[PDB]
Amino acid sequence: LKRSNEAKNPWLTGNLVEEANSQGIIQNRSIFNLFANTNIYIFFRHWT
Known part of the structure; x- marks a missing residue:
């Protein structure tokens, strides 16, 4: 794009x-x- 213009796991x-x-x-x-x-997360805490 520069060149161009798990199984058996219930909810617990x-x-x-x-x-x-x-x-x-x-x-x-x-x-x-x-x-x-x-x-x-650190990149996101530097954003907030």
Whole structure:
């Protein structure tokens, strides 16, 4: 683009993934979570 112009794992924690909104599959959710390392979170704390 410069050249051109896991199995058998039930839900147990519940709290970690905030989203338990809908049965089966949530269809339209504003809510979005980013899972991060240390060097992602620090880059984000330097942004806030």
